[PDB]
Amino acid sequence: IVGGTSASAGDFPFIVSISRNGGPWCGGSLLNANTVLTAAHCVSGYAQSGFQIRAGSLSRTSGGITSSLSSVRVHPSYSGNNNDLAILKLSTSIPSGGNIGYARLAASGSDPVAGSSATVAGWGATSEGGSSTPVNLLKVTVPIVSRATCRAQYGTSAITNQMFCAGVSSGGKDSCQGDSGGPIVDSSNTLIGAVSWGNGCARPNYSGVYASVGALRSFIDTYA
């Protein structure tokens, strides 16, 4: 997260950190005791044994409850930047309670409205290419950017109806490498997306791009 602040205990109770080969990798969202939602690009094409999830901690290295993966399912239309969600099943179930909870999902057919406030969180870099990544969770609030404006930034075909955008026109606030897969929520604390892609991080005139939970809700509901 670039331009963020420290998360407090009990913020994002459903967030999980996802390590790969013992090192930082991505974020995700705990949907229920045995299921995590993340970005497809975090897991597609990699050995599933490399991953570990951690829930219930501000730290990505220590505390909370961990689990390995039992299975990985990517959206059936996932390709590159498009349809960038995956469902992970956990080898060890994780109960709600204390600083762990489960996400509430945006409805099928919904689309975040331009200008509304969203909050994204993760353990990614705080600069493009950053040499070290924070141990404790960060968060930042950014406005939704209309799909039309985002298409003017990236190209008409580049931003699909299963993506939405968020950021500040002058830059300075965004998700960044290592935040992929983690949650973005709306002003009701409903999970509206997962960190997906962008041109660099927090650049002026290049919004962060998010996989849309509303748009992909049928997939999520099938496998959750």
UniProtKB/Swiss-Prot annotation:
Query: Biological process (GO) annotations?
Result: proteolysis
* Broad class of where this protein is predominantly found: secreted
Q: Which reaction does it catalyse?
A: Preferential cleavage: Arg-|-Xaa, Lys-|-Xaa
Q: Which domain of life is it from?
A: Eukaryota
What general EC class does the enzyme of this chain belong to?
hydrolase
Q: Which UniProt keywords apply?
A: Disulfide bond, Hydrolase, Protease, Secreted, Serine protease, Signal, Zymogen
Q: Which SUPFAM superfamilies match?
A: Trypsin-like serine proteases
A Pfam match is Trypsin
PANTHER family of this UniProt entry? FI18310P1-RELATED (PTHR24276:SF98), POLYSERASE-RELATED (PTHR24276)
Q: Which family does it belong to?
A: Belongs to the peptidase S1 family.
Protein name in UniProt: Trypsin
